[PDB]
Design a binder for this molecule. Structure first.
Ligand code: NA
Ligand code: NA
Ligand code: NA
Ligand code: NA
Ligand code: NA
Ligand code: NA
Length: 342
């Protein structure tokens, strides 16, 4: 169930999103209350008497709402934060009525922006919860963030691995006009994209063949909308803490992996093994900072067919605590400094 004193600084609660398995309709949403000292595994269903859906791929708290992007069900579930009750299921559909297959969400002002596999971004209003506009980006949008009055969308072209091939750009959208202003060439199969200091946007590129392990982190400059730096370190996913990145890399062929601390300014490894206390992770599956405490959260997916765990590390790579069997394939952890009225 749990190991270590389960404890956080400055944080009332965390939510853990589990994707389950492709076409098993078994995504789930867990909640651990720090205030109440209480773990609920099935917080969406328990409160709404229906499942979150198939391949839940993203979660964010913003305003007083929780948004879950559901890829295969092709929906954005919106949940009232205080009560935990569904407000709305927003169906994400092509003009012909087919699945857009949304991937990721980002917010600016009172608007949300969702990117999908069909190569589009949808603007959604955070009050009306209606889709207002669509704009096209590149192929198979994978991820999205905001930096400097602009959205940056990873054009993975991931689903084209066998046809035209993976895509190679980050689209830039101007928020005020919701017009796509440029495609910045970054490298093959871009993925996770996070904003950083000095108007920086960082993106991983996963290579033309994901099994090969040709992973780069690229830094974009948002002032000029050009690449600033391409690093040499093999990065599959990362989280930023100022000029420090917490990253990992995983080899699908050899199941070997590494978790590291990395200096974004010098482009050098600070510590070759983030973990300093000898805690094993077989399948690191996400990595993110708790912004209220600066702890590092990594998920363990094991072999993708048993329930995964959540692990909390201080920045010195000592494990604080872990929550075991939290969900099937936990891929995102999020944090509230304010308790839900639940
Ligand atoms: Na659930
Ligand atoms: Na809630
Ligand atoms: Na495609
Ligand atoms: Na992101
Ligand atoms: Na590769
Ligand atoms: Na799992």
């Amino acid at each position: 169930e749990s190991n270590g004193d389960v404890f956080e600084t400055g944080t009332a609660e965390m939510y853990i999103l589990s994707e389950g398995l492709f076409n098993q309709n078994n995504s789930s949403l867990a909640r651990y209350s720090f205030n109440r000292q209480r773990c609920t595994n099935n917080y969406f269903s328990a409160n709404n008497q229906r499942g979150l859906g198939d391949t839940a791929n993203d979660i964010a708290i913003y305003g007083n709402k929780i948004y879950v992007v559901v890829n295969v069900s092709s929906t954005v579930e919106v949940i009232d934060f205080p009560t935990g009750k569904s407000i709305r299921q927003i169906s994400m559909l092509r003009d012909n009525g087919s699945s857009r297959q949304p991937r990721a969400i980002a917010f600016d002002k009172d608007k949300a922006y969702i990117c999908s596999y069909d190569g589009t971004v949808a603007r959604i209003d955070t009050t009306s919860l209606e889709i207002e506009e669509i704009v096209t980006v590149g192929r198979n949008a994978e991820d999205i963030c905001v930096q400097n009055g602009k959205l940056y969308v990873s054009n993975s072209g991931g689903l084209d691995y066998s046809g035209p091939g993976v895509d190679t750009t980050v689209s830039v959208i101007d928020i005020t006009t919701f017009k796509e202003t440029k495609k910045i060439e970054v490298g093959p199969n871009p993925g996770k994209i996070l904003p950083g200091l000095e108007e920086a946007v960082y993106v991983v590129t996963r290579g033309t063949d994901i099994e090969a392990g040709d992973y780069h982190l690229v830094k974009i400059d948002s002032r000029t909308d050009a690449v600033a730096i391409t690093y040499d370190e093999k990065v599959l996913s990362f989280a930023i803490d100022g000029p420090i990145a917490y990253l990992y890399t995983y080899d699908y062929q050899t199941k070997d992996s590494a978790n590291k601390v990395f200096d974004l300014n010098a482009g050098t490894v600070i510590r070759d093994n983030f973990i300093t206390d000898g805690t094993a992770i077989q399948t690191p599956f996400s990595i993110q900072l708790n912004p209220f405490s600066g702890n590092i959260y990594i998920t363990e997916a094991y072999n993708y067919t048993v329930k995964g765990d959540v692990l909390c590390f201080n920045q010195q790579g000592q494990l604080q605590y872990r929550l075991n069997d939290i969900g099937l394939n936990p891929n995102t952890v999020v944090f509230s400094d304010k308790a839900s009225q639940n």
